[PDB]
């Protein structure tokens, strides 16, 4: 039971703040991949690269 | 280049209401609902019950919720008001032209379904205090409220604001009461601009269709006389005199609404020295310091209170009080030129006709007149009415004024305010 | 409105996600830069000395 | 019946004539008895110096007190005598002389708009009365909390510009402008091209015409001379005014950002965006069910005493924002709400909101236009500010556009992440620190 939260204004709301909470994942993601130095991803990133050849 | 504009229409039913309705092609629709309900229909046992049913027009009604009533009118841009004279309430709302049939069902339900819930009556009681005390401010306010309760034993002497003492105290039984009694199809008027006058007729019908109340324009006010006096030190004394004059549409009233214009009213130019205003260069001959003067012209159903309104400083109260009586005096014995009539009857009809130019205007005058005299007079037939009033007449009024057992109200320092009898 | 500030301003900064998500990726790239930099600082004023520079001595 | 979008269409519209002097001439027709007639110049304290700041302000006292065909109080005595209305206003961009009339009266009220006009016989003794008079009402204005603010707000926003400047002037201003100083004032600003003729009610626009042809037309013939006279930008500042008074019962604040001027279509949107936040005192009737989140919070937890939110407009600038009257322990509170709105409907506006602001608006503009008085201001008003007059069925069509995202992109761009003017005046040591309402101009979760 949450039946509350669903309505046009609602549904208005969500979509407002869809490019936040994607931009906010898009932080999230290569803060991770920053932090971990997470090689499966950085491989890719074709300046950013610590192993040789 | 503007259309053939339509005429007013007029209906009374049998059960006594009465409707009045103007389309005017107008973008908004204005709608009033006017009740003989003001303040002179309270006794000493519910004193200040009018004012808390002024304030407590969006409180839950028959579906329709406080909460409804708020956002739905606002939902629409709307306005919702309650004006109140000691005579009337009157109920108004305003909206875009389309939005009538739902800002119309929360009128009805406001003024014919209103529940009065015991907590809802109770979480109102504190907005008395502010808004008596905002009204207050003024202390033209004070004044006039002790004017009416030194002139009247009865009915006209109550305030238009709760008594202290009442605050917290008026019930939701005094309320119900109140509307049950009050708010009858005989003492009702349904006004509208910019709606059809079939629509206003069918709602009438359909939802106005109640008595269980009262008759008459009331127990009649009694006139007494006296004075009230409230010490202040205000650095300015603001002073009303006061004699019993003539009730609304009699002849008589309209010799004291021109006596009124000879005297003076309101300003007409901005800064200006009021040259055609004989109280105000009376008053400026003998006093060289800031004040004030108008003539004071209230009329009602059973009762009149004219004479005139000062603000003068503490020590120049007596003379400025002194200078205006002496000028309505000068009046009474006869010293009134013909060209002073006719300019006083040029702002009048002028000032009448300006009244009514605005729809808020238009409407309270359609309104009040259809309570007062079951009828409606066109602005022309309002002007031969001004016009008929003969010099001798305005003499008068004047020589009524000054005969007749006074009602003094007065704020300030008062330590040279004179008393009635040193007049 | 030509000015490098105000593009700076008006495409990355004035959203705070954006502002963020330019400091996170602009982290990345510093983090490159200034080891690749520092390094070569630091090996340049000890010229040879280092196991690195030593290394082809011994063979393969 | 008629619907709204029909009603429109019915008012009549304004009709506009060029005199040969450049005196522009309009009038809106109605059915009525009476008439509002006046004359509005493009003058105001914005055109004057540091040096006859005031200088309008003090003719706008000496307007009424005499001309060369009629001295002392000879116009009064016949304004009063028909029983006419004769009154002024004065503001940083506009002055208005008008006549609220009976309709017959037109012919004289246009000769006495006139006379007042080009023949301001500023008698030296009229002018020594004169500056007592304007010291009080300085004196008085002091105790004005929200005309002070309002002043305040002007003199940070507006810093080193003529906008920073009060409409009445300083008080050494007022006791040391001579009658050059003011007849010079009136020479160079009085000038046909930059006024007009508005009337509105029972008149045929010929007679207008005619009436301003014939008492109008001795004014810029071959007067058209001089540096004529050009504004230039005034500088937006975003800044701080702060008159510390705990004496006072009361805190006044207002806050603006940088609104634009009179031409912006943007303003439509940060119109319906600012009747959406609203206004509120503590005589409104039910007030936990206020649809604006301010007003509703406001009136729950006793916040404030009065707001109102605004946009002031002036040329190709202005004061967008709200402002404020409550108790010393509440400043913080109605600042932190207040900002809250702005920047919730920068970045999450909704529809239904959106559509209660642009029903609000019409109501409004339809509600304003209502009585001979306003509908001439309004003529006059806007044939200085638009050049045309804009009519009711063009707003309808600007206020209908309105949407959402409209809202989002408009407040937004005034804003967000903006530096506001403040000004405060009172008991005002719960005033938030400035960078904390800059601060407060954007969001860190969005």
Same mark, same amino acid.
């Given at each position: 039971?949450?039946?509350?939260?669903?309505?046009?204004?609602?549904?208005?709301?969500?979509?407002?703040?869809?490019?936040?909470?994607?931009?906010?994942?898009?932080?999230?993601?290569?803060?991770?991949?920053?932090?971990?130095?997470?090689?499966?991803?950085?491989?890719?990133?074709?300046?950013?690269?610590?192993?040789?050849? | 280049?503007?259309?053939?504009?339509?005429?007013?229409?007029?209906?009374?039913?049998?059960?006594?209401?009465?409707?009045?309705?103007?389309?005017?092609?107008?973008?908004?629709?204005?709608?009033?609902?006017?009740?003989?309900?003001?303040?002179? !229909?309270?006794?000493?046992?519910?004193?200040?019950?009018?004012?808390?049913?002024?304030?407590?027009?969006?409180?839950?009604?028959?579906?329709?919720?406080?909460?409804?009533?708020?956002?739905?009118?606002? @939902?629409?841009?709307?306005?919702?008001?309650?004006?109140?004279?000691?005579?009337?309430?009157?109920?108004?709302?305003?909206?875009?032209?389309?939005?009538?049939?739902?800002?119309?069902?929360?009128?009805?339900?406001?003024?014919?379904?209103?529940?009065?819930?015991?907590?809802? &009556?109770?979480?109102?009681?504190?907005?008395?205090?502010?808004?008596?005390?905002?009204?207050?401010?003024?202390?033209?306010?004070? &004044?006039?409220?002790?004017?009416?309760?030194?002139?009247?034993?009865?009915?006209?002497?109550?305030?238009?604001?709760?008594?202290? !003492?009442?605050?917290?105290?008026?019930?939701?039984?005094?309320?119900?009461?109140?509307?049950?009694?009050?708010?009858?199809?005989?003492?009702?008027?349904?006004?509208?601009?910019?709606?059809? $006058?079939?629509?206003?007729?069918? &709602?009438?019908?359909?939802?106005?269709?109640?008595?269980?109340?009262?008759?008459?324009?009331?127990?009649?006010?009694?006139? $007494?006389?006296?004075?009230?006096?409230?010490?202040?030190?205000?650095?300015?004394?603001?002073?009303?005199?006061?004699?019993?004059?003539?009730?609304?549409?009699?002849?008589?009233?309209?010799?004291?609404?021109?006596?009124? $214009?000879?005297?003076? @009213?309101?300003?007409?130019?901005?800064?200006?020295?009021?040259?055609?205003?004989?109280?105000?260069?009376?008053?400026?001959?003998?006093?060289?310091?800031?004040?004030?003067?108008?003539?004071?012209?209230?009329?009602?159903?059973?009762?009149?209170?004219?004479?005139?309104?000062?603000?003068?400083? @503490?020590?120049?109260?007596?003379?400025?009080?002194?200078?205006?009586?002496?000028?309505?005096?000068?009046?009474?014995?006869?010293?009134?030129?013909?060209?002073?009539?006719?300019?006083?009857?040029?702002?009048?009809?002028?000032?009448?006709?300006?009244? &009514?130019?605005?729809?808020?205007?238009?409407?309270?005058?359609?309104?009040?007149?259809?309570?007062?005299?079951?009828?409606?007079?066109?602005?022309?037939?309002?002007?031969?009415?001004?016009?008929?009033?003969?010099? @001798?007449?305005?003499?008068?009024?004047?020589?009524?004024?000054?005969?007749?057992?006074?009602?003094?109200?007065?704020?300030?320092?008062?330590?040279?305010?004179?008393?009635?009898?040193?007049? | 409105?030509?000015?490098?500030?105000?593009?700076?301003?008006?495409?990355?900064?004035?959203?705070?996600?954006?502002?963020?998500?330019?400091?996170?990726?602009?982290?990345?790239?510093?983090?490159?830069?200034?080891?690749?930099?520092?390094?070569?600082?630091?090996? +340049?004023?000890?010229?040879?000395?280092?196991?690195?520079?030593?290394? +082809?001595?011994?063979?393969? | 019946?008629?619907?709204?979008?029909?009603?429109? %269409?019915?008012?009549?519209?304004? #009709?506009?004539?060029?005199?040969? =002097?450049?005196?522009?001439?309009?009038?809106?027709?109605?059915?009525?008895?009476?008439?509002?007639?006046?004359?509005?110049?493009?003058?105001?304290?914005?055109?004057?110096?540091?040096?006859?700041?005031?200088?309008?302000?003090?003719?706008?006292?000496?307007?009424?007190?005499?001309?060369?065909?009629?001295?002392? =109080?000879?116009?009064?005595?016949?304004?009063?005598?028909?029983?006419?209305?004769?009154?002024?206003?004065?503001?940083?961009?506009?002055?208005?002389?008008?006549?609220?009339?009976?309709?017959?009266?037109?012919?004289?009220?246009?000769?006495?708009?006139?006379?007042?006009?080009?023949?301001?016989?500023?008698? *030296?003794? %009229?002018?020594?009365?004169?500056? *007592?008079?304007?010291?009080?009402?300085?004196?008085?204005?002091?105790?004005?909390?929200?005309?002070?603010?309002?002043?305040?707000?002007?003199? /940070?926003?507006?810093?080193? /510009?003529?906008?920073?400047?009060?409409?009445?002037?300083?008080?050494?201003?007022?006791?040391?402008?001579?009658?050059?100083?003011?007849?010079?004032?009136?020479?160079?600003?009085?000038?046909?091209?930059?006024?007009?003729?508005?009337?509105?009610?029972?008149?045929?626009?010929?007679?207008?015409?005619?009436?301003? %042809?014939?008492?109008?037309?001795?004014?810029?013939?071959?007067?058209?001379?001089?540096?004529?006279?050009?504004?230039?930008?005034?500088?937006?500042?975003?800044? #701080?005014?702060?008159?510390?008074?705990?004496?006072?019962?009361?805190?006044?604040?207002?806050?603006?950002?940088?609104?634009?001027?009179?031409?912006?279509?943007?303003?439509?949107?940060?119109?319906?965006?600012?009747?959406?936040?609203?206004?509120? *005192?503590?005589?409104?009737?039910?007030?936990?069910?206020?649809?604006?989140?301010?007003?509703?919070?406001?009136?729950?937890?006793?916040?404030?005493?009065?707001?109102?939110?605004?946009?002031?407009?002036?040329?190709? /600038?202005?004061?967008?924002?709200?402002?404020?009257?409550?108790?010393?322990?509440?400043?913080?509170?109605?600042?932190?709400?207040?900002?809250?709105?702005?920047?919730?409907?920068?970045?999450?506006?909704?529809?239904?909101?959106?559509?209660?602001?642009?029903?609000?608006?019409?109501?409004?503009?339809?509600?304003?236009?209502?009585?001979?008085?306003?509908?001439?201001?309004?003529?006059?008003?806007?044939?200085?500010?638009?050049?045309?007059?804009?009519?009711?069925?063009?707003?309808?069509?600007?206020?209908?556009?309105? *949407?959402?995202?409209?809202?989002?992109?408009?407040?937004?761009?005034?804003?967000?992440?903006?530096?506001?003017?403040?000004?405060?005046?009172?008991?005002?040591?719960?005033?938030?620190?400035?960078?904390?309402?800059?601060?407060?101009?954007?969001?860190?979760?969005?």
């Amino acid at each position: 039971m949450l039946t509350r939260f669903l309505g046009p204004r609602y549904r208005q709301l969500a979509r407002n703040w869809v490019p936040t909470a994607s931009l906010w994942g898009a932080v999230g993601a290569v803060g991770l991949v920053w932090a971990t130095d997470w090689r499966l991803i950085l491989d890719w990133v074709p300046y950013i690269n610590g192993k040789f050849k | 280049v503007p259309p053939h504009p339509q005429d007013l229409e007029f209906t009374r039913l049998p059960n006594g209401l009465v409707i009045a309705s103007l389309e005017n092609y107008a973008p908004a629709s204005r709608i009033g609902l006017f009740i003989k309900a003001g303040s002179r !229909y309270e006794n000493s046992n519910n004193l200040g019950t009018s004012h808390l049913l002024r304030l407590a027009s969006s409180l839950t009604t028959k579906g329709a919720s406080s909460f409804k009533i708020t956002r739905g009118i606002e @939902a629409v841009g709307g306005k919702l008001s309650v004006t109140s004279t000691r005579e009337n309430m009157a109920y108004t709302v305003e909206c875009l032209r389309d939005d009538v049939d739902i800002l119309m069902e929360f009128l009805l339900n406001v003024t014919t379904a209103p529940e009065f819930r015991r907590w809802e &009556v109770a979480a109102l009681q504190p907005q008395l205090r502010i808004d008596k005390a905002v009204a207050l401010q003024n202390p033209q306010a004070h &004044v006039i409220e002790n004017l009416h309760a030194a002139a009247y034993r009865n009915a006209l002497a109550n305030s238009l604001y709760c008594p202290d !003492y009442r605050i917290g105290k008026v019930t939701p039984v005094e309320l119900h009461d109140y509307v049950q009694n009050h708010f009858t199809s005989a003492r009702m008027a349904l006004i509208g601009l910019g709606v059809s $006058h079939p629509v206003l007729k069918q &709602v009438a019908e359909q939802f106005l269709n109640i008595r269980g109340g009262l008759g008459l324009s009331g127990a009649k006010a009694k006139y $007494h006389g006296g004075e009230i006096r409230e010490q202040n030190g205000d650095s300015l004394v603001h002073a009303a005199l006061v004699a019993e004059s003539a009730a609304i549409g009699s002849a008589e009233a309209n010799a004291f609404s021109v006596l009124q $214009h000879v005297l003076g @009213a309101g300003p007409h130019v901005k800064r200006g020295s009021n040259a055609t205003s004989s109280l105000y260069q009376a008053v400026a001959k003998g006093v060289h310091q800031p004040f004030d003067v108008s003539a004071f012209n209230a009329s009602y159903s059973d009762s009149g209170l004219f004479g005139f309104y000062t603000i003068s400083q @503490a020590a120049s109260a007596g003379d400025v009080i002194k200078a205006a009586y002496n000028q309505v005096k000068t009046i009474a014995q006869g010293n009134l030129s013909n060209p002073d009539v006719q300019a006083a009857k040029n702002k009048l009809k002028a000032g009448y006709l300006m009244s &009514v130019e605005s729809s808020e205007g238009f409407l309270d005058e359609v309104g009040s007149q259809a309570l007062a005299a079951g009828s409606y007079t066109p602005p022309s037939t309002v002007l031969q009415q001004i016009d008929a009033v003969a010099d @001798a007449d305005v003499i008068n009024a004047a020589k009524k004024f000054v005969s007749g057992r006074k009602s003094m109200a007065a704020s300030g320092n008062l330590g040279h305010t004179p008393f009635i009898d040193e007049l | 409105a030509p000015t490098l500030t105000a593009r700076l301003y008006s495409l990355l900064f004035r959203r705070t996600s954006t502002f963020a998500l330019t400091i996170v990726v602009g982290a990345l790239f510093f983090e490159r830069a200034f080891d690749q930099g520092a390094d070569a600082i630091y090996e +340049h004023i000890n010229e040879g000395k280092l196991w690195k520079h030593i290394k +082809h001595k011994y063979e393969n | 019946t008629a619907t709204y979008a029909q009603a429109l %269409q019915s008012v009549p519209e304004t #009709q506009v004539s060029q005199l040969d =002097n450049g005196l522009r001439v309009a009038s809106e027709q109605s059915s009525q008895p009476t008439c509002t007639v006046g004359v509005w110049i493009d003058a105001g304290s914005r055109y004057e110096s540091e040096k006859n700041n005031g200088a309008g302000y003090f003719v706008e006292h000496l307007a009424f007190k005499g001309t060369k065909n009629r001295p002392g =109080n000879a116009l009064e005595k016949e304004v009063e005598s028909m029983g006419a209305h004769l009154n002024a206003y004065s503001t940083r961009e506009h002055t208005a002389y008008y006549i609220k009339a009976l309709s017959k009266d037109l012919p004289k009220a246009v000769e006495l708009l006139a006379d007042i006009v080009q023949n301001c016989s500023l008698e *030296d003794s %009229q002018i020594e009365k004169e500056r *007592d008079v304007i010291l009080q009402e300085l004196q008085e204005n002091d105790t004005s909390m929200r005309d002070v603010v309002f002043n305040y707000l002007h003199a /940070t926003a507006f810093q080193g /510009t003529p906008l920073a400047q009060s409409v009445e002037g300083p008080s050494e201003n007022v006791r040391k402008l001579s009658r050059a100083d003011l007849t010079e004032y009136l020479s160079r600003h009085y000038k046909a091209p930059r006024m007009v003729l508005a009337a509105a009610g029972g008149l045929e626009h010929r007679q207008l015409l005619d009436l301003a %042809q014939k008492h109008f037309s001795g004014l810029s013939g071959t007067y058209d001379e001089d540096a004529v006279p050009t504004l230039s930008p005034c500088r937006f500042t975003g800044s #701080q005014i702060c008159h510390r008074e705990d004496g006072l019962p009361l805190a006044h604040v207002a806050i603006a950002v940088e609104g634009p001027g009179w031409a912006h279509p943007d303003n439509v949107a940060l119109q319906v965006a600012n009747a959406i936040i609203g206004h509120y *005192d503590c005589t409104y009737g039910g007030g936990a069910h206020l649809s604006s989140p301010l007003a509703s919070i406001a009136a729950t937890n006793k916040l404030c005493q009065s707001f109102q939110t605004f946009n002031i407009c002036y040329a190709d /600038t202005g004061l967008l924002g709200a402002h404020f009257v409550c108790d010393h322990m509440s400043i913080d509170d109605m600042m932190f709400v207040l900002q809250g709105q702005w920047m919730r409907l920068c970045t999450s506006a909704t529809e239904s909101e959106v559509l209660r602001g642009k029903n609000l608006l019409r109501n409004a503009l339809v509600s304003h236009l209502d009585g001979t008085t306003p509908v001439c201001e309004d003529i006059g008003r806007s044939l200085l500010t638009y050049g045309r007059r804009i009519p009711l069925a063009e707003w309808e069509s600007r206020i209908a556009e309105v *949407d959402a995202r409209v809202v989002r992109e408009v407040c937004s761009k005034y804003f967000y992440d903006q530096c506001p003017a403040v000004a405060g005046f009172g008991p005002i040591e719960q005033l938030p620190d400035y960078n904390r309402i800059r601060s407060g101009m954007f969001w860190l979760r969005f």
